[PDB]
Amino acid sequence: LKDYALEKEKVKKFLQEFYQDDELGKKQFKYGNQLVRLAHREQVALYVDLDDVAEDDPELVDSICENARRYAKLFADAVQELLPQYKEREVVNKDVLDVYIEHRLMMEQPAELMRRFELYFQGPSSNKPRVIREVRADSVGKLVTVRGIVTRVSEVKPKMVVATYTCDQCGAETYQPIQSPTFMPLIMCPSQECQTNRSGGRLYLQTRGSRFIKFQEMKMQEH
Amino acid sequence: LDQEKKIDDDASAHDQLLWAIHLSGLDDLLLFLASSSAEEQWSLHVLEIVSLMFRDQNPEQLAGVGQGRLAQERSADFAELEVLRQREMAEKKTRALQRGNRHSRFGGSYIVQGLKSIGERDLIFHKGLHNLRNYSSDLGKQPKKVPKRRQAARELSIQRRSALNVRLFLRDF
Ligand SMILES: [Zn+2]
């Protein structure tokens, strides 16, 4: 397998150096500009285009198309590492969830809780759309493109991403990142003071601190 | 008495049997045996008989009795019931004011700024705002479990009064 550290540096190089002959050929480095907007919280999602990557490294594009999930995580971490370099400005406080984070910083002075951006791939122009019948089991885990008609859509629901608890006795806080479709919550304090004294303090979950994302379910059908 | 569980002024098995002693006139022979000099060998037994009879009645309250006790107990019992009801009402209202008005899932959380924990930082308080008026940190804790052999002594007995007929007879005897 590849060294994902080397791949991380290659991705950083792409973000740092790529220009699409952009802004009417003025070569203003589209992804650098995007990183400025992301750093100043002007924008949330970032759609990286695989046709741009193909100009420098088609083998990287092929590496992405199979086992896409690894490269999703990789690109997200690369963007988080590069974001402070494109910052120059202090942003105004505008969200209760971030007021909690600000209090947490003030008291301190995991990264998943702070990572307020989304990263998605726009498919390479080589890949023609499949019909819903041709997405067979040899395509598990691979990036695909599909075409059809929508039949049903749900309302938008809050989906849990990381839970935040508080302890009645010791005044500390704890975190629990969520990935599977289900989880089991915490009960009793794992901090060293409570544990060593066996003082039995309980954990209360805080909807003012935990992180949520907009989630919706949909169905699509053959022509 | 654990089997009978009778209210005061009702007759227990001992009370009914004692009343039967009076109704039979057997008590007169106890007084003869106690008063006659030559019957001294029986007087020692009569002491046990008499002392067995009077066990439930203390002499001070027994000396207290009289024919007007009916109205006295009736009126006093109404007064006792009144004060008992009043006490429960008062205690209920104190608890009602101490509790918050909104339901038990209404939530909220406060930091007691400057009051440090057992840990390095300030206390976080999860309960209702009104509870801080009389706060003590121990309120959440269960009591210490004592060992079996560590327990102190206790009474196996309780105060009582027999039926008024029995009380009057005992006073005469
Ligand atoms: Zn604790």
Experimental technique used to determine this entry: cryo-EM
Nearest to A169 among B109, B117, B122 (CB): B117
Return the number of other C-beta atoms located less than 10 Å from residue B99's C-beta.
11
Which of A129, A114, A131, A127 has its CA nearest to residue A64? A127
Counted across chains A and B, CB pairs separated by less than 8 A come out at 31
Distance of alpha carbon A47 from alpha carbon A81, whole angstroms: 18
Residues near ligand 1 ion, CB 5 Å cutoff: A 167, 169-170, 189, 191, 194, 201
Token code pair at residue A18: 């790529």
Apex B41 CA angle, B40 and B44, nearest 5: 85
Distance of alpha carbon B80 from alpha carbon A161, whole angstroms: 63
First to last CA, chain A: 40
Place of tokens 């759609």: A47
A207 phi and psi angles, rounded to 5 deg = -65, -10
Assess contact for A12 and A81: CB atoms under 8 A. yes
Token code pair at residue A102: 């600000």
Assess contact for B105 and A154: CB atoms under 8 A. no
For A26-117, strand residue ranges (E) read: 45-49
Which of B163, B165, B173 has its CA nearest to residue B56? B163
Assess contact for A106 and A40: CB atoms under 8 A. no
Token code pair at residue A93: 């406080």
From the candidates A165, A166, A170, which should be mutated to test the interface with B, based on the most B CB atoms within 10 A?
A170
Return the number of other C-beta atoms located less than 10 Å from residue B88's C-beta.
9
Distance of alpha carbon A89 from alpha carbon A80, whole angstroms: 17
A90-97 long-range CB contacts below 8 Å, 24 or more apart?
A91/A40, A91/A41, A96/A208, A97/A208, A97/A209, A97/A211
Residue of A nearest to B119 (CA): A170
Q: What is the resolution of this structure in A?
A: 3.4
DSSP letter, residue A124: P
Burial (0-12, 13-18, 19+ Cβ within 10 Å), A38: buried
**Contacts with A172 from chain B: Cβ below 8 Å:** 119, 121
